[PDB]
RNA sequence: UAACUGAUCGGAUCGAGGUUUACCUCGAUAAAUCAUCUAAGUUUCUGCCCUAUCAGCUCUCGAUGGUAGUGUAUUGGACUACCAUGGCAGUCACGGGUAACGGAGAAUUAGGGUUCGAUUCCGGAGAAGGAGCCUGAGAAACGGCUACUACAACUACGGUUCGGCAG
RNA sequence: GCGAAUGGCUCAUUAAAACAGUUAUAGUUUAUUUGAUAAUUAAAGAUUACAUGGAUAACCGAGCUAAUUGUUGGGCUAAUACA
C-alpha cells in the first residue's frame, strides 16, 4: 500500500465507541499511544459523544486548546483532540475535579466510571514483560506501556500491579493463579469479572483460561485476555454496570420488565 | 577427514570452538553445539556424537522452530537433506455433501542425525524459509512400511 | 554584445553597448571569469582589467 | 532497479508465474561490491576506500571497495590487533574471487605476524624470529621475570604449523566480515580443524 | 577479555509566569538506544469459474536440493560460483478462455440449489503504454523527475511547458 | 520545519496469483506518539564555553530571452540551516 494509513472511517471505527452510523464518514482516527487502536478511546470521543460537555467538533478545539487545561490522564495534562485513553486509567476533568475510569461495559461498550477522590489515586497496571537491562538493572512494563526500574523481584511475567500515581509508587500486586479475580480486556467475553479457574498451557503458541463469578457461569479465553482484576475474590476497583457480570437477554428482562 | 572435506570447502559450527579448545587441554574438549528446540520433542541421539555440520538442522543451528508442526508419509529420499512428504486429506463439496481426496506435497529438511527411508511417517515443524520451497525440518521420524507403491497407499494420518 | 559590468569595490552596475566588431574579438574562444584586457576598448576603458 | 522479487521465478511445477505488481521499490536490489587489496599500489595510491550507502530505515551501510589493513584475531590466545593484510589465497565460493583478491566473508587471506609477534614476545618472553635464539628473559631470576616463565612452562605447543607461519612472516587467517556491507575486514587467525585442510588445498592446489 | 571504526549518541537552541539577591516555577524543541504505539514487507495452512479438439511440464542457465559468498530491512537460487539431479502431475500437472480484480455481500429459495457481484467496508492493482530514479521514516510515487513509443499546449521555429481529468 | 507516500477515481491486468479465514517473524523496517535511559566527549588535533566560525535567501541594484512558479550576475545581515 501507497504509505501507512491516516484517516478512519465512520462505518469502520469499533462499535464499543457506541458510534453514530448516520453521523458523518469519518471519525477521529486514534493517535498513535499508550494504547492499540481498536482497545482506545479518543479524548474526542471521551467528550462529545460521552460525557457531552462538549458537542461539535471546534467544541473540543477549545478545550484541548485552551490555555486552561481541562483534561487530565493519569495525573498529566493532555492536549490531543485523539488521545487513546485505554483500559485501567484515570481522566480528570480539571474545571469540575471529575475522576473516571476507561473500563468496558459487560456488553464491551467503553464506559465511564466514577471515582472518589480516593481510587483517583491509584490506578491498576498489569504487566507487559520483564527482564533485566543496562547495567545490570531489572525492568517491569505495563499494558499501559509503562516502563519500570527496580520494582519488586516477587513479580512474574503475567502479573498485576496496583499504582499509586501520587508518589508514582507500587503496592501490593498479585499474579494470575488458580483464585483470583479479574477482568478481561478483550474478547467474546470482555467486560466479565470472575474467579480464576486454573490456566492450561498449551505451548505450541496459545494458553487458555478458565473462569466463574457470581451467578457460577463458565468463563473461557486466552491468557492474554484476562487482566487480575485482584487477589483472592476481593476485587481492587468498582465495577460499571453493578458487577462485572452480563445477563441473559432473559436475564435482562425479567430484572427490567420482569417477565 | 571426511565429515569436514568431503568437496565442499569446509565445515565448522556455529559455536566456533576447536582449535581454541587445544588450551583446555584437560577436560572434555570435543564440543559440537547442542540444542533443544522443547516442544515436547527429544533431541536425537545420533544429533549430538555425529561429525555433521548441517547448518540447517533444529538441534545443530539457530534454527527456531515456530507455530505450524506437521506430520505426513514420506514420498522420496532424493536430495541432498531434503524429503518430500505427501499429506492425505478428504475435502467436502457442500453440494453433493461428500467428500473427494487430495493431497499436499511438501519440502521438508532433514536433518543427517535421523536416517530416512522411503514410505515412513514423519512430523515436521515450522522452521523460517530455507530455500524456494523448503519451510519445514523434520524433528521427529518414525519407520513405516508400505510394500510396494507410496502414491496408491493414502492414510488419513 | 552588450555588457552588464560590475564594480566590486563600491556597487557599480554599469552597461555598456558595443556594436563594432573589432573590439569584442578579444573575448572570443576565452572561458568564464577569465582575466580580461579591456584596452581592447581604447575610448573609456583604458587599461582596465 | 535490480529486483530480487521472487514473482519472476517458475513456481514448483515449473509453469510460469504472473504478475500485475511493476517492481516495487522495497525490493531493492543494490550493485555489487567486489572489494580488492592495496597490498600492491602499483598504480592503486589512494590504499583503502570505502563509500557509505543510504539504506533502508534511515541509517547508512559502508561499503568496502578497496581495503590493505583490517583487523584479526588469535583464536587461542584471545589476542586481537589491527594487522596489514597480504594476499588473498583460495576464496571456495570461486577461485576468480582470489584472481582479482576480491573480499569475501569467508575468504582466506594472509597477515603480517608484526602485532601477534610482538605480543607474543611481551608475554612470553618468545620472540618467534628463527628458532636459534628462541627466548630472550631478563638478566635476574628473582622478581616478576618469574611469570614468562610459568606462562612459557604452560607447554605452548603451539602447533608445528602456528610456528613455521610466524618466521615466514606471513599468517593464515580467514574472513568473518561482509566488507559490501560494514566497510570493515575482520578475520580470525586459522588453526587445527581448518588449518591443516585449508593448506591442503593449497598444498596439493599448485602442486 | 582482546582490538577495530570513529560517518552512533552524550543540547553553542526557544518561551512564558514569578521574584531584593544568592534566582525560582511550568513549558517548546532538537536528538541517541530500549520499549510502545502505527503500518509495512515477506510467511504457514485451506479454498476458486469454463477447458484435454491442453498430457506430459520445468532444466543453456535455475528447474528442485546441497554447499560457500554476494545483496537486502531481513529470510530465500533473490543473484554469483561449485556440486547433486531433482521439483509437478488423472487426488488433472503444464497450457488455453473468461464481457473474471477476490471478499464483506446482492436477486429468487419449502429443503437442496441457480445467477451475480465494476460499484460506500477491506485487501490488491494502476494512473496514456512501459522501463529507470531523486528524495524520504515512507513510494518505482505519479495531481514529482529521466529516456523511448504514441500524443497534448506556446513559438519571433532558436526554444519552452507545474504537459496526462481512471479527482 | 513538517506535509505532500492520506485521501479521491478506477478495474485494464490478475485463477493458488490476488484474496479470505488462519499462522510466523528466533527472518525484518517503521517519521509522528506514549513510558524509560544515560557521571565519563574517543586518539592525533585543537581548545571560548559566560558559548566559536564561515556563507546565502528575502532586500538594494545591473541584465538576458518572443517565450513559462526560467535565471545570470554584483552588494547587504539571522538562525534549531550550515560548519
Ligand atoms: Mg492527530
Ligand atoms: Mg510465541
Ligand atoms: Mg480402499
Ligand atoms: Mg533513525
Ligand atoms: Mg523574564
Ligand atoms: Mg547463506
Ligand atoms: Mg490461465
Ligand atoms: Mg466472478
Ligand atoms: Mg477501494
Ligand atoms: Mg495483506
Ligand atoms: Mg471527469
Ligand atoms: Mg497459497
Ligand atoms: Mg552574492
Excluded at chain 1, 19 to 38: C, D, E, F, V, Y
Excluded at chain 2, 8 to 14: I, V
Excluded at chain 4, 17 to 42: D, N, Y
Aim: glycine residues 8%; charged residues 30%.
Amino acid at each position: 500500500a501507497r504509505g501507512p494509513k491516516k484517516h478512519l472511517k465512520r462505518i469502520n471505527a469499533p462499535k464499543s465507541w457506541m458510534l453514530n452510523k448516520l453521523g458523518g464518514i469519518w471519525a477521529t482516527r486514534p493517535s498513535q499511544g499508550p494504547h492499540k487502536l481498536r482497545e482506545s478511546l479518543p479524548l474526542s470521543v471521551l467528550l462529545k459523544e460521552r460525557l457531552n460537555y462538549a458537542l461539535n467538533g471546534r467544541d473540543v478545539t477549545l478545550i484541548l486548546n485552551d490555555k486552561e487545561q481541562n483534561v487530565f490522564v493519569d495525573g498529566k495534562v493532555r492536549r490531543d483532540k485523539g488521545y487513546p485513553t485505554g483500559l485501567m486509567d484515570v481522566v480528570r476533568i480539571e474545571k469540575t475535579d471529575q475522576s473516571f475510569r476507561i473500563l468496558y461495559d459487560t456488553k464491551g461498550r467503553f464506559v465511564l466510571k466514577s471515582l472518589s477522590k480516593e481510587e483517583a489515586k491509584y490506578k491498576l497496571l498489569k504487566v507487559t514483560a520483564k527482564a533485566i537491562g543496562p547495567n545490570q538493572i531489572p525492568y517491569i512494563v505495563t499494558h499501559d506501556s509503562r516502563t519500570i526500574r527496580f520494582p519488586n523481584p516477587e513479580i512474574k511475567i503475567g502479573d498485576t500491579l496496583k499504582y499509586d500515581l501520587v508518589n508514582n509508587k507500587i503496592e501490593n500486586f498479585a499474579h494470575l493463579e488458580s483464585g483470583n479475580v479479574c477482568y478481561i480486556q478483550q474478547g467474546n467475553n470482555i467486560g466479565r469479572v470472575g474467579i480464576i479457574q486454573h490456566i492450561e498451557k498449551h505451548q505450541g503458541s496459545f494458553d487458555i483460561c478458565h473462569v466463574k463469578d457470581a451467578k457460577g457461569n463458565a468463563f473461557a479465553t486466552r491468557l492474554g485476555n484476562i487482566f487480575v482484576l485482584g487477589q483472592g475474590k476481593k476485587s481492587w476497583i468498582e465495577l460499571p454496570s453493578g458487577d462485572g457480570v452480563r445477563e441473559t437477554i432473559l436475564e435482562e428482562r425479567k430484572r427490567k420488565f420482569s417477565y | 577427514m571426511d565429515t569436514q572435506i568431503q568437496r565442499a570447502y569446509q565445515k565448522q559450527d556455529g559455536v566456533f570452538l576447536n582449535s581454541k579448545k587445544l588450551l583446555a587441554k584437560k577436560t572434555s574438549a570435543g564440543v559440537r553445539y547442542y540444542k533443544n528446540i522443547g516442544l515436547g520433542f527429544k533431541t536425537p541421539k545420533e544429533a549430538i556424537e555425529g561429525t555433521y555440520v548441517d547448518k540447517k538442522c533444529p538441534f545443530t543451528s539457530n534454527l527456531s522452530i515456530r507455530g505450524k508442526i506437521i506430520k505426513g508419509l514420506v514420498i522420496s529420499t532424493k536430495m541432498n537433506r531434503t524429503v518430500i512428504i505427501r499429506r492425505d486429506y478428504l475435502h467436502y463439496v457442500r453440494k453433493y455433501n461428500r467428500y473427494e481426496k487430495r493431497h499436499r506435497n511438501i519440502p521438508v529438511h532433514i536433518s543427517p542425525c535421523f536416517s530416512v527411508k522411503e514410505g515412513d511417517i514423519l512430523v515436521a515443524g515450522q522452521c523460517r524459509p530455507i530455500s524456494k520451497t523448503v519451510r519445514f525440518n523434520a524433528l521427529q521420524v518414525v519407520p513405516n512400511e508400505i510394500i510396494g507403491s507410496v502414491r496408491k497407499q493414502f492414510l488419513l494420518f | 554584445m552588450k555588457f552588464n559590468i560590475s564594480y566590486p569595490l563600491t556597487g557599480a552596475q554599469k552597461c555598456i553597448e558595443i556594436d563594432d566588431d573589432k573590439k569584442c574579438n578579444i573575448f572570443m574562444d576565452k572561458k568564464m571569469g577569465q582575466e580580461v584586457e579591456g584596452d581592447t576598448l581604447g575610448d573609456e576603458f583604458k587599461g582596465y582589467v | 532497479g535490480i529486483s530480487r522479487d521472487s514473482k519472476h521465478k517458475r513456481r514448483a511445477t515449473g509453469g510460469r508465474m504472473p504478475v500485475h505488481r511493476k517492481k516495487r521499490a522495497f525490493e531493492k536490489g543494490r550493485p555489487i561490491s567486489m572489494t580488492k587489496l592495496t597490498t600492491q599500489s602499483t598504480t592503486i595510491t589512494e590504499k583503502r576506500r570505502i563509500r557509505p550507502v543510504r539504506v533502508r530505515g534511515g541509517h547508512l551501510k559502508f561499503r568496502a571497495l578497496r581495503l590493505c589493513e583490517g583487523n584479526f584475531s588469535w583464536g587461542s590466545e584471545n589476542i586481537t590487533r589491527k594487522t596489514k593484510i597480504l594476499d588473498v589465497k583460495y576464496n571456495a565460493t570461486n577461485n576468480e574471487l582470489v584472481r582479482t583478491k576480491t573480499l569475501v566473508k569467508n575468504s582466506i587471506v594472509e597477515i603480517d605476524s608484526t602485532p601477534f609477534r610482538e605480543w607474543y614476545k611481551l608475554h612470553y618472553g618468545i620472540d618467534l624470529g628463527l628458532k636459534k635464539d628462541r627466548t630472550v628473559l631478563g638478566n635476574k631470576e628473582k622478581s616478576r621475570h618469574v611469570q614468562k616463565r610459568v606462562k612459557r612452562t604452560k607447554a605452548q605447543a603451539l602447533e608445528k604449523n602456528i610456528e613455521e607461519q610466524f618466521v615466514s612472516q606471513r599468517i593464515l587467517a580467514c574472513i568473518t566480515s561482509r566488507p559490501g556491507q560494514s566497510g570493515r575486514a575482520d578475520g580470525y587467525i586459522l588453526e587445527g580443524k581448518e588449518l591443516e585442510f585449508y593448506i591442503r588445498k593449497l598444498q596439493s592446489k599448485k602442486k
